[PDB]
């Protein structure tokens, strides 16, 4: 309903005509703009006392198909420091051929133990529909995951884990207006998980597909935009403040998300409640920050809350940046992916993450990672 800012027009009106101007001038502008006005600033990268502890390693998980590691990523040296728990499945066929496996990495909503029924994972399997682990493994990809609540609660009435506590305490009684919220913390945790993958000799951290569904897809996008080590970015039905254009004011709006989830974004993002016309950015520019690395955005046909048309139109509005790198986006009809390095599909049915979503993502990763 409101015109989108041009990703190729700088803050001073200069037109960006090449990928070198983009990477060196326009990219840092937009990152700062999304930091200040939407997600909050990421206040640290790698902490100096980060410690990796492999707590379990099972060489014959899932009937022999995968090696399974559970890893404590602790962010201080004191063994009582805050930490997150990474679960990693590696396909044993890939290990057997002395290859480092490409990886699908994403946060989960209900706990590492919910991604598969595997009773050794430290409500089991109750989220299996969104996590076809054996099929990903059979296709030759490792699967790495961390529970989002290790880093920050999902609901505003959630319990704090040690990492959320540490950040909560650091925020005193109130956050600064440009301080990060849950999506920024979630994105940061994905980059710390990638830090671990760099050290694990079973996996190729240069071939990591960072994915997320819904709120954790907001986080995957923000992680991929800030951290260009990620090889490929997948946003499944991330909706408002993820891939959907805020200025379309369709489905969930800025005021609605900030009201129900006041810890997800920066306080500054609340200044755009029922004022999306004033946003100096929109989500097509977040998609653009992933270029030239491959980016997959997908919708569900009945998921009006997420604004599927707004998600597709953000992909289209980001395409000119991808075209600076000679990549192509979508030219769509249901169940027909479209686009080259910048890809979109919309499937029938409700909000969710299905076998067909993953079939499309696996084929995408095959093209770019295998
Ligand atoms: O997670 C998932 C979704 O959960 C809620 O529906 C929320 O309103 C959305 O913004 C979010 O993307
Ligand atoms: Na590695
Ligand atoms: Na919306």
Author numbering: 33 to 154, 176 to 384, 389 to 427
Copy text verbatim from the article accompanying this structure deposition.
Glucuronoyl esterases (GEs) are α/β serine hydrolases and a relatively new addition in the toolbox to reduce the recalcitrance of lignocellulose, the biggest obstacle in cost-effective utilization of this important renewable resource. The bacterial GE OtCE15A possesses a classical yet distinctive catalytic machinery, with easily identifiable catalytic Ser/His completed by two acidic residues (Glu and Asp) rather than one as in the classical triad, and an Arg side chain participating in the oxyanion hole. As a classical ABH, the reaction catalyzed by OtCE15A was assumed to proceed through a covalent intermediate preceded by an acylation and followed by a deacylation step, both going through a tetrahedral transition state. The formation of the CI (acylation step) and breakdown of the CI to release the final product (deacylation) both go through formation of a tetrahedral transition state with a charge on the oxygen stabilized by the so-called oxyanion hole.
In many ABHs, this is formed solely by backbone nitrogen atoms from the enzyme, but for bacterial GEs, the side chain guanidinium moiety of the Arg immediately following the Ser nucleophile (Arg268 in OtCE15A) has been proposed to play this role. To further probe the role of R268, the R268A variant was constructed in silico in the SHED catalytic assembly as the QM region, which can in our simulations interact electrostatically with the MM area. However, in the deacylation step of the R268A variant, the proton transfer was not accompanied by nucleophilic attack. Furthermore, in the specified time scale, the proton cannot complete its transfer process to His408, as the corresponding barrier is exceedingly large. This suggests that the CI would easily accumulate in this variant. The OtCE15A-R268A variant was constructed experimentally and kinetic parameters determined with both BnzGlcA and MeGlcA. With both substrates the kcat is reduced >80-fold compared to the WT enzyme, and there is also reduction in Km as observed previously with the H408A variant, which would be consistent with accumulation of the CI. Indeed, crystallographic determination of the OtCE15A-R268A structure after soaking with the BnzGlcA substrate clearly shows the formation of a CI, mainly arising from the significantly damaged interactions in TI2. The CI in the crystal structure of OtCE15A-R268A was compared with the one generated from our simulation and the one of OtCE15A-H408A variant, showing little differences. Furthermore, our theoretical results indicated that the conserved active-site arginine, whose side chain is proposed to contribute to forming the oxyanion hole, plays a prominent role in both acylation and deacylation steps, especially in the latter. This is reflected in a large reduction in activity of the R268A mutant as produced experimentally here and accumulation of the CI in the variant demonstrated in the determined X-ray structure.
